[PDB]
Amino acid sequence: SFSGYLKLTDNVYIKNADIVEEAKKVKPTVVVNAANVYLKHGGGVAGALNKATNNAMQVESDDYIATNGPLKVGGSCVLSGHNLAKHCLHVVGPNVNKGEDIQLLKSAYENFNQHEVLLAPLLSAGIFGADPIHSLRVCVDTVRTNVYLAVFDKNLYDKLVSSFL
Ligand SMILES: CC(C)NCc1ccc(N(C)C)cc1
């Protein structure tokens, strides 16, 4: 199962790891993607997860959008996990670089509560522009299920652990 994680709370764990490498190793039931409303997996975590699936995640996502239309900011959908996981939970955190409301970050993390255990990135962090320290705080105060957070950047991982209240 999950190894090498630091326990932050009763249900939140954290590790300095590449979420693609972590997914290929653990083969979790659920891997969370840092999705946008269009499921266009171009960059950041989404671009990396999609590249690992040889673009199969993008082909499946385009069919999902053609049928259902875009997701809401704060919303999610469950699609295949391809070669990375049983399922991928595509969760849309607000992208503050696109002017999306940061208050929707709690709604985005609420989607994790529908799954007993997840491998996930910090929502709205990285290219989504939010403060990752704030994202971790919203995560621990919102998610009640078991979440294993993979933080790619070592320097950010160290800052997140050393500043965790
Ligand atoms: C039971 C859990 C640890 N693994 C579920 C599971 C997830 C993904 C895959 N593959 C082959 C991508 C296989 C199995």
PDB file of N, CA and C in Angstrom, residues 25-127:
ATOM      1  N   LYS A  25       3.324   2.983  -8.544  1.00  0.00           N
ATOM      2  CA  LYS A  25       3.824   2.109  -7.488  1.00  0.00           C
ATOM      3  C   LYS A  25       2.680   1.547  -6.604  1.00  0.00           C
ATOM      4  N   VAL A  26       1.802   2.426  -6.116  1.00  0.00           N
ATOM      5  CA  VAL A  26       0.756   2.029  -5.182  1.00  0.00           C
ATOM      6  C   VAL A  26      -0.417   1.377  -5.880  1.00  0.00           C
ATOM      7  N   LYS A  27      -0.732   1.836  -7.115  1.00  0.00           N
ATOM      8  CA  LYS A  27      -1.931   1.457  -7.867  1.00  0.00           C
ATOM      9  C   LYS A  27      -3.180   1.699  -6.997  1.00  0.00           C
ATOM     10  N   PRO A  28      -3.376   2.955  -6.536  1.00  0.00           N
ATOM     11  CA  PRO A  28      -4.464   3.200  -5.587  1.00  0.00           C
ATOM     12  C   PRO A  28      -5.820   2.960  -6.220  1.00  0.00           C
ATOM     13  N   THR A  29      -6.856   2.822  -5.389  1.00  0.00           N
ATOM     14  CA  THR A  29      -8.226   2.734  -5.911  1.00  0.00           C
ATOM     15  C   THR A  29      -8.581   4.072  -6.580  1.00  0.00           C
ATOM     16  N   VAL A  30      -8.158   5.194  -5.969  1.00  0.00           N
ATOM     17  CA  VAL A  30      -8.454   6.521  -6.513  1.00  0.00           C
ATOM     18  C   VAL A  30      -7.214   7.406  -6.543  1.00  0.00           C
ATOM     19  N   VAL A  31      -6.910   7.962  -7.710  1.00  0.00           N
ATOM     20  CA  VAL A  31      -5.926   9.015  -7.830  1.00  0.00           C
ATOM     21  C   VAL A  31      -6.701  10.293  -8.170  1.00  0.00           C
ATOM     22  N   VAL A  32      -6.426  11.393  -7.483  1.00  0.00           N
ATOM     23  CA  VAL A  32      -7.059  12.665  -7.772  1.00  0.00           C
ATOM     24  C   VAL A  32      -6.251  13.427  -8.814  1.00  0.00           C
ATOM     25  N   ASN A  33      -6.943  13.939  -9.837  1.00  0.00           N
ATOM     26  CA  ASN A  33      -6.323  14.822 -10.805  1.00  0.00           C
ATOM     27  C   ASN A  33      -6.703  16.267 -10.472  1.00  0.00           C
ATOM     28  N   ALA A  34      -5.730  17.181 -10.614  1.00  0.00           N
ATOM     29  CA  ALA A  34      -5.927  18.624 -10.492  1.00  0.00           C
ATOM     30  C   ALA A  34      -6.449  19.094 -11.863  1.00  0.00           C
ATOM     31  N   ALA A  35      -7.751  18.897 -12.059  1.00  0.00           N
ATOM     32  CA  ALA A  35      -8.420  19.140 -13.320  1.00  0.00           C
ATOM     33  C   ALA A  35      -8.879  20.586 -13.475  1.00  0.00           C
ATOM     34  N   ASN A  36      -9.186  20.971 -14.718  1.00  0.00           N
ATOM     35  CA  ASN A  36      -9.882  22.210 -14.986  1.00  0.00           C
ATOM     36  C   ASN A  36     -11.310  21.810 -15.479  1.00  0.00           C
ATOM     37  N   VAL A  37     -12.213  22.797 -15.610  1.00  0.00           N
ATOM     38  CA  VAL A  37     -13.604  22.520 -15.971  1.00  0.00           C
ATOM     39  C   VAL A  37     -13.772  21.842 -17.304  1.00  0.00           C
ATOM     40  N   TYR A  38     -12.801  22.016 -18.199  1.00  0.00           N
ATOM     41  CA  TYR A  38     -12.875  21.423 -19.543  1.00  0.00           C
ATOM     42  C   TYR A  38     -12.206  20.061 -19.629  1.00  0.00           C
ATOM     43  N   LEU A  39     -11.593  19.587 -18.525  1.00  0.00           N
ATOM     44  CA  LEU A  39     -10.783  18.381 -18.518  1.00  0.00           C
ATOM     45  C   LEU A  39      -9.700  18.435 -19.602  1.00  0.00           C
ATOM     46  N   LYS A  40      -9.090  19.615 -19.777  1.00  0.00           N
ATOM     47  CA  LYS A  40      -7.988  19.752 -20.743  1.00  0.00           C
ATOM     48  C   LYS A  40      -6.714  19.604 -19.932  1.00  0.00           C
ATOM     49  N   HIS A  41      -6.098  18.432 -20.023  1.00  0.00           N
ATOM     50  CA  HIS A  41      -4.967  18.068 -19.166  1.00  0.00           C
ATOM     51  C   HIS A  41      -3.651  18.478 -19.798  1.00  0.00           C
ATOM     52  N   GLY A  42      -3.407  19.776 -19.822  1.00  0.00           N
ATOM     53  CA  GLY A  42      -2.235  20.296 -20.516  1.00  0.00           C
ATOM     54  C   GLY A  42      -0.963  20.385 -19.712  1.00  0.00           C
ATOM     55  N   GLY A  43      -1.071  20.834 -18.480  1.00  0.00           N
ATOM     56  CA  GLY A  43       0.099  21.114 -17.667  1.00  0.00           C
ATOM     57  C   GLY A  43      -0.108  20.749 -16.218  1.00  0.00           C
ATOM     58  N   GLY A  44       0.915  20.967 -15.407  1.00  0.00           N
ATOM     59  CA  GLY A  44       0.885  20.637 -13.983  1.00  0.00           C
ATOM     60  C   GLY A  44       0.637  19.165 -13.741  1.00  0.00           C
ATOM     61  N   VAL A  45      -0.060  18.851 -12.653  1.00  0.00           N
ATOM     62  CA  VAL A  45      -0.413  17.462 -12.350  1.00  0.00           C
ATOM     63  C   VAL A  45      -1.225  16.812 -13.488  1.00  0.00           C
ATOM     64  N   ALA A  46      -2.211  17.532 -14.025  1.00  0.00           N
ATOM     65  CA  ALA A  46      -3.057  16.955 -15.092  1.00  0.00           C
ATOM     66  C   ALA A  46      -2.274  16.564 -16.318  1.00  0.00           C
ATOM     67  N   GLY A  47      -1.360  17.421 -16.741  1.00  0.00           N
ATOM     68  CA  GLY A  47      -0.539  17.123 -17.914  1.00  0.00           C
ATOM     69  C   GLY A  47       0.362  15.929 -17.666  1.00  0.00           C
ATOM     70  N   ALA A  48       0.906  15.822 -16.437  1.00  0.00           N
ATOM     71  CA  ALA A  48       1.758  14.706 -16.088  1.00  0.00           C
ATOM     72  C   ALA A  48       0.961  13.387 -15.999  1.00  0.00           C
ATOM     73  N   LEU A  49      -0.223  13.409 -15.353  1.00  0.00           N
ATOM     74  CA  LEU A  49      -1.048  12.189 -15.268  1.00  0.00           C
ATOM     75  C   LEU A  49      -1.490  11.752 -16.656  1.00  0.00           C
ATOM     76  N   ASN A  50      -1.941  12.724 -17.479  1.00  0.00           N
ATOM     77  CA  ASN A  50      -2.391  12.373 -18.817  1.00  0.00           C
ATOM     78  C   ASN A  50      -1.244  11.780 -19.651  1.00  0.00           C
ATOM     79  N   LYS A  51      -0.042  12.388 -19.585  1.00  0.00           N
ATOM     80  CA  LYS A  51       1.100  11.872 -20.351  1.00  0.00           C
ATOM     81  C   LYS A  51       1.415  10.429 -19.942  1.00  0.00           C
ATOM     82  N   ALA A  52       1.286  10.122 -18.640  1.00  0.00           N
ATOM     83  CA  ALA A  52       1.538   8.754 -18.146  1.00  0.00           C
ATOM     84  C   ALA A  52       0.547   7.729 -18.701  1.00  0.00           C
ATOM     85  N   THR A  53      -0.683   8.180 -19.020  1.00  0.00           N
ATOM     86  CA  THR A  53      -1.690   7.308 -19.644  1.00  0.00           C
ATOM     87  C   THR A  53      -1.565   7.264 -21.182  1.00  0.00           C
ATOM     88  N   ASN A  54      -0.504   7.846 -21.767  1.00  0.00           N
ATOM     89  CA  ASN A  54      -0.312   7.862 -23.224  1.00  0.00           C
ATOM     90  C   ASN A  54      -1.496   8.576 -23.900  1.00  0.00           C
ATOM     91  N   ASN A  55      -2.051   9.608 -23.240  1.00  0.00           N
ATOM     92  CA  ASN A  55      -3.164  10.423 -23.721  1.00  0.00           C
ATOM     93  C   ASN A  55      -4.532   9.742 -23.626  1.00  0.00           C
ATOM     94  N   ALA A  56      -4.607   8.522 -23.056  1.00  0.00           N
ATOM     95  CA  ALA A  56      -5.904   7.853 -22.941  1.00  0.00           C
ATOM     96  C   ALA A  56      -6.828   8.634 -21.995  1.00  0.00           C
ATOM     97  N   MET A  57      -6.269   9.275 -20.944  1.00  0.00           N
ATOM     98  CA  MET A  57      -7.073  10.099 -20.052  1.00  0.00           C
ATOM     99  C   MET A  57      -7.724  11.265 -20.822  1.00  0.00           C
ATOM    100  N   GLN A  58      -6.960  11.914 -21.717  1.00  0.00           N
ATOM    101  CA  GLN A  58      -7.512  13.020 -22.508  1.00  0.00           C
ATOM    102  C   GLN A  58      -8.597  12.561 -23.484  1.00  0.00           C
ATOM    103  N   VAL A  59      -8.413  11.403 -24.128  1.00  0.00           N
ATOM    104  CA  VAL A  59      -9.420  10.889 -25.066  1.00  0.00           C
ATOM    105  C   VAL A  59     -10.711  10.577 -24.307  1.00  0.00           C
ATOM    106  N   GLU A  60     -10.590   9.928 -23.143  1.00  0.00           N
ATOM    107  CA  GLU A  60     -11.769   9.626 -22.346  1.00  0.00           C
ATOM    108  C   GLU A  60     -12.433  10.917 -21.850  1.00  0.00           C
ATOM    109  N   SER A  61     -11.628  11.901 -21.450  1.00  0.00           N
ATOM    110  CA  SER A  61     -12.119  13.167 -20.924  1.00  0.00           C
ATOM    111  C   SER A  61     -12.857  13.965 -21.990  1.00  0.00           C
ATOM    112  N   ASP A  62     -12.342  13.978 -23.225  1.00  0.00           N
ATOM    113  CA  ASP A  62     -13.020  14.700 -24.304  1.00  0.00           C
ATOM    114  C   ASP A  62     -14.389  14.076 -24.597  1.00  0.00           C
ATOM    115  N   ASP A  63     -14.505  12.734 -24.529  1.00  0.00           N
ATOM    116  CA  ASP A  63     -15.810  12.096 -24.716  1.00  0.00           C
ATOM    117  C   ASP A  63     -16.740  12.508 -23.546  1.00  0.00           C
ATOM    118  N   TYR A  64     -16.220  12.522 -22.300  1.00  0.00           N
ATOM    119  CA  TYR A  64     -17.028  12.932 -21.147  1.00  0.00           C
ATOM    120  C   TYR A  64     -17.549  14.383 -21.330  1.00  0.00           C
ATOM    121  N   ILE A  65     -16.686  15.317 -21.761  1.00  0.00           N
ATOM    122  CA  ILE A  65     -17.096  16.701 -21.958  1.00  0.00           C
ATOM    123  C   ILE A  65     -18.078  16.832 -23.127  1.00  0.00           C
ATOM    124  N   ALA A  66     -17.864  16.068 -24.205  1.00  0.00           N
ATOM    125  CA  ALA A  66     -18.798  16.124 -25.338  1.00  0.00           C
ATOM    126  C   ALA A  66     -20.221  15.696 -24.890  1.00  0.00           C
ATOM    127  N   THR A  67     -20.304  14.734 -23.974  1.00  0.00           N
ATOM    128  CA  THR A  67     -21.602  14.256 -23.487  1.00  0.00           C
ATOM    129  C   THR A  67     -22.204  15.150 -22.409  1.00  0.00           C
ATOM    130  N   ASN A  68     -21.380  15.599 -21.459  1.00  0.00           N
ATOM    131  CA  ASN A  68     -21.883  16.266 -20.260  1.00  0.00           C
ATOM    132  C   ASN A  68     -21.664  17.739 -20.135  1.00  0.00           C
ATOM    133  N   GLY A  69     -20.782  18.297 -20.944  1.00  0.00           N
ATOM    134  CA  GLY A  69     -20.400  19.691 -20.783  1.00  0.00           C
ATOM    135  C   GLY A  69     -19.371  19.812 -19.666  1.00  0.00           C
ATOM    136  N   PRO A  70     -18.933  21.047 -19.448  1.00  0.00           N
ATOM    137  CA  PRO A  70     -17.877  21.275 -18.456  1.00  0.00           C
ATOM    138  C   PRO A  70     -18.293  21.033 -17.022  1.00  0.00           C
ATOM    139  N   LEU A  71     -17.302  20.760 -16.180  1.00  0.00           N
ATOM    140  CA  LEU A  71     -17.553  20.622 -14.755  1.00  0.00           C
ATOM    141  C   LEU A  71     -17.722  22.033 -14.178  1.00  0.00           C
ATOM    142  N   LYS A  72     -18.107  22.115 -12.906  1.00  0.00           N
ATOM    143  CA  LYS A  72     -18.186  23.372 -12.206  1.00  0.00           C
ATOM    144  C   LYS A  72     -16.841  23.523 -11.484  1.00  0.00           C
ATOM    145  N   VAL A  73     -16.405  24.768 -11.232  1.00  0.00           N
ATOM    146  CA  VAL A  73     -15.248  24.983 -10.347  1.00  0.00           C
ATOM    147  C   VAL A  73     -15.727  24.543  -8.931  1.00  0.00           C
ATOM    148  N   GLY A  74     -14.984  23.647  -8.311  1.00  0.00           N
ATOM    149  CA  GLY A  74     -15.372  23.056  -7.038  1.00  0.00           C
ATOM    150  C   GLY A  74     -15.977  21.674  -7.219  1.00  0.00           C
ATOM    151  N   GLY A  75     -16.236  21.260  -8.464  1.00  0.00           N
ATOM    152  CA  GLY A  75     -16.863  19.985  -8.735  1.00  0.00           C
ATOM    153  C   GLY A  75     -15.897  18.912  -9.157  1.00  0.00           C
ATOM    154  N   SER A  76     -16.433  17.742  -9.483  1.00  0.00           N
ATOM    155  CA  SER A  76     -15.606  16.615  -9.852  1.00  0.00           C
ATOM    156  C   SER A  76     -16.349  15.632 -10.716  1.00  0.00           C
ATOM    157  N   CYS A  77     -15.627  14.698 -11.289  1.00  0.00           N
ATOM    158  CA  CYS A  77     -16.220  13.546 -11.918  1.00  0.00           C
ATOM    159  C   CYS A  77     -15.265  12.370 -11.734  1.00  0.00           C
ATOM    160  N   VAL A  78     -15.816  11.164 -11.734  1.00  0.00           N
ATOM    161  CA  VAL A  78     -15.030   9.940 -11.626  1.00  0.00           C
ATOM    162  C   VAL A  78     -14.875   9.330 -13.001  1.00  0.00           C
ATOM    163  N   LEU A  79     -13.649   9.151 -13.442  1.00  0.00           N
ATOM    164  CA  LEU A  79     -13.377   8.517 -14.715  1.00  0.00           C
ATOM    165  C   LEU A  79     -12.379   7.368 -14.462  1.00  0.00           C
ATOM    166  N   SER A  80     -11.928   6.702 -15.519  1.00  0.00           N
ATOM    167  CA  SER A  80     -10.994   5.597 -15.348  1.00  0.00           C
ATOM    168  C   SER A  80      -9.656   6.111 -14.815  1.00  0.00           C
ATOM    169  N   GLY A  81      -8.980   5.260 -14.056  1.00  0.00           N
ATOM    170  CA  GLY A  81      -7.624   5.555 -13.601  1.00  0.00           C
ATOM    171  C   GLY A  81      -6.573   5.044 -14.581  1.00  0.00           C
ATOM    172  N   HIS A  82      -7.004   4.368 -15.676  1.00  0.00           N
ATOM    173  CA  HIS A  82      -6.099   3.877 -16.723  1.00  0.00           C
ATOM    174  C   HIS A  82      -5.000   2.978 -16.112  1.00  0.00           C
ATOM    175  N   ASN A  83      -3.730   3.239 -16.409  1.00  0.00           N
ATOM    176  CA  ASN A  83      -2.612   2.469 -15.869  1.00  0.00           C
ATOM    177  C   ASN A  83      -2.102   3.003 -14.526  1.00  0.00           C
ATOM    178  N   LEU A  84      -2.792   3.981 -13.946  1.00  0.00           N
ATOM    179  CA  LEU A  84      -2.321   4.624 -12.732  1.00  0.00           C
ATOM    180  C   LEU A  84      -3.096   4.236 -11.479  1.00  0.00           C
ATOM    181  N   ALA A  85      -4.375   3.896 -11.635  1.00  0.00           N
ATOM    182  CA  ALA A  85      -5.277   3.690 -10.500  1.00  0.00           C
ATOM    183  C   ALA A  85      -6.548   2.983 -11.005  1.00  0.00           C
ATOM    184  N   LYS A  86      -7.461   2.538 -10.101  1.00  0.00           N
ATOM    185  CA  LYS A  86      -8.712   1.966 -10.575  1.00  0.00           C
ATOM    186  C   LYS A  86      -9.557   3.127 -11.188  1.00  0.00           C
ATOM    187  N   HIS A  87      -9.649   4.241 -10.435  1.00  0.00           N
ATOM    188  CA  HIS A  87     -10.402   5.417 -10.838  1.00  0.00           C
ATOM    189  C   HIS A  87      -9.559   6.666 -10.756  1.00  0.00           C
ATOM    190  N   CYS A  88      -9.894   7.667 -11.572  1.00  0.00           N
ATOM    191  CA  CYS A  88      -9.328   8.981 -11.411  1.00  0.00           C
ATOM    192  C   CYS A  88     -10.473   9.889 -11.022  1.00  0.00           C
ATOM    193  N   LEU A  89     -10.335  10.565  -9.881  1.00  0.00           N
ATOM    194  CA  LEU A  89     -11.307  11.570  -9.469  1.00  0.00           C
ATOM    195  C   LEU A  89     -10.777  12.931  -9.948  1.00  0.00           C
ATOM    196  N   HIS A  90     -11.383  13.481 -11.005  1.00  0.00           N
ATOM    197  CA  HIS A  90     -10.966  14.767 -11.562  1.00  0.00           C
ATOM    198  C   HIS A  90     -11.631  15.829 -10.747  1.00  0.00           C
ATOM    199  N   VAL A  91     -10.856  16.589  -9.973  1.00  0.00           N
ATOM    200  CA  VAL A  91     -11.417  17.601  -9.095  1.00  0.00           C
ATOM    201  C   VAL A  91     -10.969  18.964  -9.544  1.00  0.00           C
ATOM    202  N   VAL A  92     -11.905  19.909  -9.692  1.00  0.00           N
ATOM    203  CA  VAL A  92     -11.563  21.263 -10.113  1.00  0.00           C
ATOM    204  C   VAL A  92     -11.452  22.202  -8.928  1.00  0.00           C
ATOM    205  N   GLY A  93     -10.219  22.511  -8.540  1.00  0.00           N
ATOM    206  CA  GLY A  93     -10.015  23.545  -7.542  1.00  0.00           C
ATOM    207  C   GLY A  93     -10.006  24.884  -8.273  1.00  0.00           C
ATOM    208  N   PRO A  94     -10.302  25.991  -7.593  1.00  0.00           N
ATOM    209  CA  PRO A  94     -10.206  27.307  -8.247  1.00  0.00           C
ATOM    210  C   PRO A  94      -8.778  27.623  -8.698  1.00  0.00           C
ATOM    211  N   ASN A  95      -8.682  28.196  -9.901  1.00  0.00           N
ATOM    212  CA  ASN A  95      -7.420  28.622 -10.446  1.00  0.00           C
ATOM    213  C   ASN A  95      -7.447  30.114 -10.248  1.00  0.00           C
ATOM    214  N   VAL A  96      -6.700  30.601  -9.257  1.00  0.00           N
ATOM    215  CA  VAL A  96      -6.707  32.039  -8.985  1.00  0.00           C
ATOM    216  C   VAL A  96      -5.982  32.822 -10.090  1.00  0.00           C
ATOM    217  N   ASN A  97      -5.110  32.164 -10.888  1.00  0.00           N
ATOM    218  CA  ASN A  97      -4.500  32.841 -12.051  1.00  0.00           C
ATOM    219  C   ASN A  97      -5.565  33.121 -13.149  1.00  0.00           C
ATOM    220  N   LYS A  98      -6.669  32.358 -13.167  1.00  0.00           N
ATOM    221  CA  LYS A  98      -7.800  32.569 -14.071  1.00  0.00           C
ATOM    222  C   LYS A  98      -8.940  33.365 -13.363  1.00  0.00           C
ATOM    223  N   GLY A  99      -8.679  33.920 -12.174  1.00  0.00           N
ATOM    224  CA  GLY A  99      -9.617  34.714 -11.384  1.00  0.00           C
ATOM    225  C   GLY A  99     -10.734  33.960 -10.689  1.00  0.00           C
ATOM    226  N   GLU A 100     -10.580  32.624 -10.564  1.00  0.00           N
ATOM    227  CA  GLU A 100     -11.621  31.816  -9.899  1.00  0.00           C
ATOM    228  C   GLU A 100     -11.614  32.020  -8.391  1.00  0.00           C
ATOM    229  N   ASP A 101     -12.791  31.947  -7.778  1.00  0.00           N
ATOM    230  CA  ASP A 101     -12.954  32.244  -6.361  1.00  0.00           C
ATOM    231  C   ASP A 101     -12.262  31.205  -5.455  1.00  0.00           C
ATOM    232  N   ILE A 102     -11.253  31.645  -4.672  1.00  0.00           N
ATOM    233  CA  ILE A 102     -10.512  30.809  -3.729  1.00  0.00           C
ATOM    234  C   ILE A 102     -11.434  30.168  -2.681  1.00  0.00           C
ATOM    235  N   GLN A 103     -12.601  30.791  -2.377  1.00  0.00           N
ATOM    236  CA  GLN A 103     -13.539  30.201  -1.403  1.00  0.00           C
ATOM    237  C   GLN A 103     -14.093  28.832  -1.888  1.00  0.00           C
ATOM    238  N   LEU A 104     -13.996  28.544  -3.218  1.00  0.00           N
ATOM    239  CA  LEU A 104     -14.434  27.270  -3.774  1.00  0.00           C
ATOM    240  C   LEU A 104     -13.449  26.114  -3.488  1.00  0.00           C
ATOM    241  N   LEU A 105     -12.286  26.406  -2.855  1.00  0.00           N
ATOM    242  CA  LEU A 105     -11.334  25.352  -2.549  1.00  0.00           C
ATOM    243  C   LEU A 105     -11.928  24.354  -1.548  1.00  0.00           C
ATOM    244  N   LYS A 106     -12.705  24.842  -0.543  1.00  0.00           N
ATOM    245  CA  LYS A 106     -13.322  23.908   0.398  1.00  0.00           C
ATOM    246  C   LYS A 106     -14.311  22.989  -0.323  1.00  0.00           C
ATOM    247  N   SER A 107     -15.130  23.553  -1.229  1.00  0.00           N
ATOM    248  CA  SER A 107     -16.056  22.728  -2.014  1.00  0.00           C
ATOM    249  C   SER A 107     -15.324  21.685  -2.861  1.00  0.00           C
ATOM    250  N   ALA A 108     -14.173  22.074  -3.441  1.00  0.00           N
ATOM    251  CA  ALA A 108     -13.380  21.137  -4.219  1.00  0.00           C
ATOM    252  C   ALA A 108     -12.889  19.963  -3.334  1.00  0.00           C
ATOM    253  N   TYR A 109     -12.380  20.268  -2.114  1.00  0.00           N
ATOM    254  CA  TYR A 109     -11.915  19.187  -1.221  1.00  0.00           C
ATOM    255  C   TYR A 109     -13.062  18.297  -0.728  1.00  0.00           C
ATOM    256  N   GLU A 110     -14.303  18.836  -0.651  1.00  0.00           N
ATOM    257  CA  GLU A 110     -15.442  18.003  -0.207  1.00  0.00           C
ATOM    258  C   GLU A 110     -15.678  16.790  -1.109  1.00  0.00           C
ATOM    259  N   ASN A 111     -15.284  16.894  -2.389  1.00  0.00           N
ATOM    260  CA  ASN A 111     -15.409  15.762  -3.294  1.00  0.00           C
ATOM    261  C   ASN A 111     -14.619  14.540  -2.800  1.00  0.00           C
ATOM    262  N   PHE A 112     -13.506  14.783  -2.066  1.00  0.00           N
ATOM    263  CA  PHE A 112     -12.690  13.659  -1.572  1.00  0.00           C
ATOM    264  C   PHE A 112     -13.456  12.790  -0.560  1.00  0.00           C
ATOM    265  N   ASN A 113     -14.436  13.383   0.134  1.00  0.00           N
ATOM    266  CA  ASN A 113     -15.197  12.642   1.150  1.00  0.00           C
ATOM    267  C   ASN A 113     -16.081  11.541   0.604  1.00  0.00           C
ATOM    268  N   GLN A 114     -16.260  11.483  -0.724  1.00  0.00           N
ATOM    269  CA  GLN A 114     -17.018  10.392  -1.322  1.00  0.00           C
ATOM    270  C   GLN A 114     -16.161   9.132  -1.551  1.00  0.00           C
ATOM    271  N   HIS A 115     -14.867   9.150  -1.162  1.00  0.00           N
ATOM    272  CA  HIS A 115     -13.959   8.036  -1.414  1.00  0.00           C
ATOM    273  C   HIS A 115     -13.221   7.722  -0.129  1.00  0.00           C
ATOM    274  N   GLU A 116     -13.187   6.442   0.281  1.00  0.00           N
ATOM    275  CA  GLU A 116     -12.571   6.090   1.564  1.00  0.00           C
ATOM    276  C   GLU A 116     -11.069   6.359   1.629  1.00  0.00           C
ATOM    277  N   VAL A 117     -10.349   6.220   0.506  1.00  0.00           N
ATOM    278  CA  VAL A 117      -8.934   6.508   0.486  1.00  0.00           C
ATOM    279  C   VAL A 117      -8.537   7.040  -0.886  1.00  0.00           C
ATOM    280  N   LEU A 118      -7.669   8.054  -0.887  1.00  0.00           N
ATOM    281  CA  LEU A 118      -7.249   8.676  -2.148  1.00  0.00           C
ATOM    282  C   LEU A 118      -5.777   9.040  -2.108  1.00  0.00           C
ATOM    283  N   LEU A 119      -5.128   8.973  -3.268  1.00  0.00           N
ATOM    284  CA  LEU A 119      -3.797   9.528  -3.529  1.00  0.00           C
ATOM    285  C   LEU A 119      -4.112  10.867  -4.208  1.00  0.00           C
ATOM    286  N   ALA A 120      -3.580  12.001  -3.700  1.00  0.00           N
ATOM    287  CA  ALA A 120      -3.975  13.293  -4.244  1.00  0.00           C
ATOM    288  C   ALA A 120      -2.896  14.319  -4.233  1.00  0.00           C
ATOM    289  N   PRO A 121      -3.024  15.325  -5.091  1.00  0.00           N
ATOM    290  CA  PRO A 121      -2.159  16.495  -4.973  1.00  0.00           C
ATOM    291  C   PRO A 121      -2.873  17.567  -4.118  1.00  0.00           C
ATOM    292  N   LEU A 122      -2.154  18.629  -3.724  1.00  0.00           N
ATOM    293  CA  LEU A 122      -2.782  19.760  -3.047  1.00  0.00           C
ATOM    294  C   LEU A 122      -3.574  20.536  -4.085  1.00  0.00           C
ATOM    295  N   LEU A 123      -4.878  20.671  -3.866  1.00  0.00           N
ATOM    296  CA  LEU A 123      -5.718  21.365  -4.837  1.00  0.00           C
ATOM    297  C   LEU A 123      -5.399  22.832  -4.894  1.00  0.00           C
ATOM    298  N   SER A 124      -5.460  23.377  -6.115  1.00  0.00           N
ATOM    299  CA  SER A 124      -5.228  24.796  -6.426  1.00  0.00           C
ATOM    300  C   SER A 124      -3.774  25.242  -6.198  1.00  0.00           C
ATOM    301  N   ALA A 125      -2.873  24.327  -5.882  1.00  0.00           N
ATOM    302  CA  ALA A 125      -1.462  24.669  -5.695  1.00  0.00           C
ATOM    303  C   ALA A 125      -0.768  24.671  -7.105  1.00  0.00           C
ATOM    304  N   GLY A 126       0.533  24.949  -7.146  1.00  0.00           N
ATOM    305  CA  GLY A 126       1.275  24.953  -8.392  1.00  0.00           C
ATOM    306  C   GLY A 126       0.756  26.004  -9.343  1.00  0.00           C
ATOM    307  N   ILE A 127       0.541  25.590 -10.609  1.00  0.00           N
ATOM    308  CA  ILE A 127       0.088  26.508 -11.647  1.00  0.00           C
ATOM    309  C   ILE A 127      -1.324  27.040 -11.442  1.00  0.00           C
TER     310      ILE A 127
END
